[PDB]
Structures are given as structure tokens and as C-alpha cells.
Chain A
């Protein structure tokens, strides 16, 4: 099985900045016919993949000139000579020299000024508690960069179990991310404790952002 390694899973670029996305093959991709069957694809959010470059360096028709490809037999590079907003998405290297494989992708996101998250904690509704369980929700909205840590504390002690997180795609207009964390508990487990805390660690502050409620 040929392994295509895209070393960088995420890249943060500014508009007009030049970027290079690398792809490393486990074995040579030079075929017996003298051709190297390595392609580059872009997949914008909510869209199907789109071919940029085929056979290492050939630009597909209709594709802007700012995209170029180069490579040896095992090391390949897609260069974007001046990123544009339409170039944001996930880049995939792919080969057909051997049984066809793809890389895991490289997300190209937009770099913006660091933004602290707006943290909100929500107790479970009386309505849901009327069923078997309770969901405690913590929102951390409009932050940058993506890297964020959320800790749930019940009566001062950390709770790791029953926690599910979800992060939105970078916003096209403000370039920020938003994350939701849900702490799922039973009604009995929820009623057993008093203080419910959401502890948020982001690079914008040395001290974590703490949001709490009681019951």
C-alpha cells in the first residue's frame, strides 16, 4: 500500500502570501512509462473535489496560474503563489502509479488577528430533566486561532466522561471559529451536585475563562 504523507495537516495563510503544500510518497511514483501519476486536488467547504494539477506539474484548464506543482519521485509540492480567499479549503495529493491512494489532506485556513472566545454556560432545561438525562452546554464563540482547551468542573473536580465537542468551519466573513461543548449526565447525577463550571484555555489569555452556574 502506497502511503502519501502530507506532513502539515493545517496551514494559516494571509491573502497574497505564497504557500507550499508537501506530499511525501512511501515508494517512488515514477511509472515504467516515464510518467509520475501524482495529482493535486482542492475541496472547498461544502463542494466536490476539484483538480488543480495532474502528473506532478501540469496545470488543469481553467485553473489559475498561481497554482504550480513540482516534485521528485517521492517528494511533491503544490505551490500557491499568492493565496486568495477562493483557495481556502482542503488540499489532497493523490497517486495512480500504484493502487490509487490519497493523502489525508492539508487544511488551508486564513490567518487573522487573535480573538478571545465569548464563553457562555447553559444549565439543562427543566423540560429535558423531565426525561432520563441532562445536557450542560458550554459555547465559546468567535475565537482565533482554532487551538482551544475546554475543561468541565463539577463541584471543583474535573469531569472527562460524557463530554462531546464540535467546532464550526472558519467563518468566511470574520475568519473565526466557534466551539460547542456538551456535558451529558443523568438527572440523578445532575441533581447530586451544585456548582457547574466551564474552564476555557486559549492563547489570548494567560488565565482561563471560567463560566459557572449552580444546581
Chain B
């Protein structure tokens, strides 16, 4: 049994998106199916559901009149037409028969435009362990990948969840190295933002 969602992406408010879920490994026409969403950091919500032959369906109050659940039994595919999209609709959408769930498709509804981040060093401003970091500010959408000395520094690495501010994301990433390593040897954070096709390397230099 396999469920694979597609159609997710970034859209401005009021715009449309159609999600699809390709099914295999079971008699599709025999299964009742649903769309379950999860807003980032939040829990699960039942969006829409449909019986094996259509005929009966359900939409949660917040999506009534905007969303349309349908299925193509001959094509083994479940659909979710989403119109008049709101920021409230930002979530990962799962296609599910309850016993089986897909990997999800992410939907981001925002007026914010794809922006590359600005990378700032976090260096101490004063026989031990030193903590250095990178402030990755003003990017959209998520995610950003942060590595230290390419893959060379992996222990003592903390990449914190991004926080939203005025439609843009900001995160910090830290690395803990021995005092004998830095500034003697180079420490660099490598920031990757696939959405804007940006790779930024920032060497951490003492203050």
C-alpha cells in the first residue's frame, strides 16, 4: 500500500492549488479516503473526506465552499481543489485511508516573496570550549540548511527552529569547538537556501 501526494507549493493569498494523491498496492474503489492537514509546529485537522464511490463527503467548516474533494477510481487518484487560499491554509497535507498515510505535500500561503537570507556571525564579545554561531536572517520560504566547515564539524552543532517575523524567517545555528581550534583554525558556516538558489559561506572572525 502506497500513498503519494503532489501539487503543494507556495502561493499568494486568494490563489488556487490542486493537490493529488497517487495510490497503489490496493483496490482504490473500495477505500474511503481523507485529507488531513498539519500547520507547522501544530497538530492534525481533518480537512475533507470521501466515500469509496463518492456520493458522500465531508468538509470541515473553515474550508466549506472553497475546497473540493474528488477521486478518479480508474486512475487510482484522490484530489483536493483548493480555491481562495488563506494564510490559515498553510500546512502539510496528508492523503490517508487511516491505516496508511502519505509522506505529505507542503502548502505555503503567503504574501511574502522568495528572499535569500543575510548571514551574520555570532562571535564572543569578551583551556575551554568556545561556542560560535551564524544568524540566518530575512529568508523565505523555509527551509535553510546550515553546515559547519562543510561537513567537518558535526558534534556540538545546534540548528534552532526558524521564527517568523514580518513574513520572513530567522534562525541561529551554533557550533561548539575547543578554544585551541578557534581562531587558530578557520570556522565557517555554510548556509543553503534552495528556494532562492543561494549558498552563503560566512567565516567567523574574532571581534
Contacts and interface: CB of A to CB of B under 8 A. Distances in A.
Contact of B163 (A94, A100, A164): A164
B131 A118 contact: yes
Interface of B: 34, 36, 43-46, 49, 58, 60, 94, 96, 98-99, 101-104, 118, 120-126, 129, 131, 133, 135, 137, 158-163, 165, 170-172, 174, 176, 207
A60 B89 CA distance: 31
A128 B120 contact: yes
A104 interface: yes
A141 B174 contact: yes
A35 interface: no
B56 to A, nearest CB: 13
A125 B134 CA distance: 10
15 contacts: A48-B104, A49-B36, A54-B99, A92-B43, A100-B34, A102-B43, A118-B131, A135-B137, A164-B163, A164-B170, A165-B163, A178-B174, A182-B172, A213-B125, A213-B126
Interface string A91-120: 010100001111111000000000000101
* The 7 nearest A-B residue pairs measured at CB: A100-B46, A123-B125, A180-B160, A122-B122, A213-B125, A166-B160, A102-B44
Contacts, number: 116
Nearest to A135: B135
A51 interface: yes
Interface in A165-181: 165-168, 178-180
A103 B46 CA distance: 11
A39 interface: yes
Main secondary structure of the interface of A (DSSP, over half): strand
Given A102-B45, A182-B172, A122 B133 contact: yes
B124 A120 contact: yes
Interface in A46-96: 48-51, 54, 60, 90, 92, 94
A191 to B, nearest CB: 15
B176 A127 contact: no
B131 A120 contact: yes
Given A41-B44, A49-B94, 10 more contacts: A39-B98, A49-B96, A100-B49, A135-B120, A135-B135, A135-B137, A137-B133, A139-B131, A164-B163, A166-B171
B104 to A, nearest CB: 6
A123 B207 contact: yes
Given A92-B43, A128-B135, A168-B158, A139 B94 contact: no
Q: How many residues of A sit at the interface, in one of the four size bands? A: 35 or more
A124 B131 CA distance: 15
Contacts of A135: 120, 135, 137, 170
Contacts of B101: 48-51
A178 B171 contact: no
B161 A139 contact: no
Nearest to B119: A127
